[PDB]
Design a protein around this ligand. Structure first.
Ligand SMILES: NC(=O)c1ccc[n+]([C@@H]2O[C@H](COP(=O)([O-])OP(=O)(O)OC[C@H]3O[C@@H](n4cnc5c(N)ncnc54)[C@H](OP(=O)(O)O)[C@@H]3O)[C@@H](O)[C@H]2O)c1
Ligand SMILES: NC(=O)c1ccc[n+]([C@@H]2O[C@H](COP(=O)([O-])OP(=O)(O)OC[C@H]3O[C@@H](n4cnc5c(N)ncnc54)[C@H](OP(=O)(O)O)[C@@H]3O)[C@@H](O)[C@H]2O)c1
Lengths: 324, 333
């Protein structure tokens, strides 16, 4: 068996600063632990996902590696479904090499950048598809509002909506991102939420006849502003509330007969092949695009993870652990 | 044409905060009971009036007009009709005036079954019954064995929701605002458990005590702090049919709801509805429920105030829980 040096990002203590994490260098024997069905992988890309905050205080353990979604190459497998040389995405450790237990998706199309399987072709892409295509029941010509529209999930939701023939507006936190939403992603309109004194008035300006669908990533005052601007039988897919303050306008659910429904992407993984079958031709035809931020090396991962909760990422924040 | 005095309940003023009796007054006018020339109007004699909580919304500046009669659902007898669909002597329910006699422009529903109390067509056989039916059967997607919580559970809508859920084999708990209403929930309506929300130190602890495995379905009539207590107690894929939020109707600023994050962790569907959208189901409802009423399988409690002069008191009393069951005003006999 190969025995190799293995750099790891370790949680130093419960929580978010760089100094709450630590780089540790250990040795690993690259062998499937005896009698298990484990998979030994070399990690290529690691995703920085907002939900990781919840686990830093199902939680992570101080002294142990951070874990998250990544893209990896299989080195050894005790599981029939995976063999040496396979590329996979799934939960893995923040380290060069991980032993992953049976409790993980094989990658088949290598014609797109591999980092995409942390975003558009990974969990965030599946989240956008589940939330918009399944939860929202969208129809051509409907009006759609996306909060956190320039993030990994939101940038896809808006494009999926444009593909269906919807009118799409997005909210973002800077000029650079607002311009991106319109220039790159093809949103009909977008606005900087930080500049608006009255979010309700802002949405009225962009939606003179109201919002059919709100893809909710934010919550709070933004939700209150959406509620008063919804159309009859409007739908709200509750994906995240990254801002998280009391919500005051829920009476609008009755007068407008709104369905507001939360979901978790892992309930929808049985639809992943269907999602891929839709989105991969669209990527290859340049009809759906994706923007990510890629940091080089594990020694960059502490910086990359912290920077996520102030919107220092543009699209999905990724860490490249290794080239291949 | 018959010429008669017509007492009316007038809205005096738009209302802020809680309504009081003095926000309304009784006026007497003379009118003639005649259909205006070439119109398709119906002249009726009002028999029963519903007091419904949504009327509070209409007291703000759709809304009522100060100086004019209050309007709402009632049961009436047709006296003259410019509409071929309605004949003298017909009994109807639908929107009418808070007065002895009204002129209507025909949905007015024609009542065919009078082997049930006519006052039932303000409640169980009228708009509240239909709300309970559509809200629970359609919006909640209920299944046998599920756990169900109903707020304002002894009221016109809630007392029916709990019975409908029991009939389906659900475990059903209700909250209400007095010992008398709690006893009624358990002894008359067949709720499995019920509690007085005013005597609970912590509503989320109270609900945890009644729903140790969580709540599959919340039929929401109250909003406010109750909704926040429910959210933290919902089961996975739980559903909330948002019917009303009466705890908010008299506030000049609503209370903030803080626990919506639970919609994500628990994958909850929270959906508002208006009974107005479900009237195509009213025949099905009436055909199901009337035989159940006549067979004593579904039961009802209404509170009948007597005379138009009692109507302001009956309406205002909804907001302090003075009604026991569906609040009705008997106009005539
Ligand atoms: N339900 C599920 O299964 C599921 C799955 C994956 C993700 N999620 C959730 O979906 C949401 C978006 O995920 P993502 O991966 O697309 O995140 P992302 O790439 O970070 O986009 C999130 C963005 O939200 C904006 N934001 C941050 N703080 C804000 C605030 N206080 N007020 C308004 N906007 C703020 C930022 O962009 P600006 O520059 O525009 O401020 C931030 O970059 C997150 O809440 C995440 O937890 C849910
Ligand atoms: N969506 C629709 O189409 C539709 C149609 C009809 C009715 N509704 C709504 O459904 C709800 C129930 O209507 P209903 O006709 O059955 O009324 P109801 O329950 O017969 O009477 C109203 C009851 O509200 C409770 N209440 C009043 N103030 C409260 C407060 N601050 N906190 C908690 N409870 C309070 C009281 O009972 P306690 O003594 O138990 O406090 C009072 O008896 C109302 O919100 C109504 O607006 C909706």
């Amino acid at each position: 068996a190969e025995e190799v040096s293995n750099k790891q990002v370790i949680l130093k203590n419960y929580v978010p600063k760089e100094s709450d994490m630590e780089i540790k260098n250990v040795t690993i024997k690259l062998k499937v632990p005896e009698g298990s069905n484990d998979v030994v992988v070399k990690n290529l890309y690691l995703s920085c996902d907002p939900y990781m905050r919840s686990r830093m205080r199902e939680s992570f353990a101080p002294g142990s590696p951070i874990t998250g979604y990544g893209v990896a190459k299989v080195l050894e497998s005790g599981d029939p479904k995976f063999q040496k040389g396979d590329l996979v995405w799934g939960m893995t450790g923040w380290e060069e090499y991980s032993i992953i237990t049976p409790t993980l998706f094989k990658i088949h199309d290598k014609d797109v950048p591999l980092s995409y399987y942390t975003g558009i072709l990974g969990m965030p892409g599946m989240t956008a598809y589940a939330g918009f295509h399944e939860v929202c029941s969208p129809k051509k010509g409907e009006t759609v509002f996306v909060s956190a529209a320039s993030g990994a999930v939101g940038q896809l939701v808006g494009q999926f909506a444009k593909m269906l023939g919807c009118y799409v507006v997005g909210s973002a936190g800077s000029k650079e991102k607002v311009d991106l939403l319109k220039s790159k992603f093809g949103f009909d309109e977008a606005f900087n939420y930080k500049e608006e004194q009255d979010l309700s008035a802002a949405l009225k300006r962009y939606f003179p006849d109201g919002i059919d669908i709100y893809f909710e990533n934010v919550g709070g005052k933004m939700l209150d502003a959406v509620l008063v601007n919804m159309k009859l039988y409007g739908r709200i897919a509750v994906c995240g509330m990254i801002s998280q303050e009391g919500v005051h306008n829920l009476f609008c659910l009755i007068t407008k007969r709104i369905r507001m429904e939360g979901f978790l992407v892992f309930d929808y993984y049985h639809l992943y092949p269907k999602y891929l079958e839709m989105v991969i031709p669209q990527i290859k035809a340049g009809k759906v695009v994706y923007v990510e931020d890629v940091a080089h090396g594990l020694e960059s991962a502490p910086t990359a993870l912290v920077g996520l909760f102030s919107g220092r990422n543009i699209g999905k924040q990724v860490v490249m652990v290794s080239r291949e």
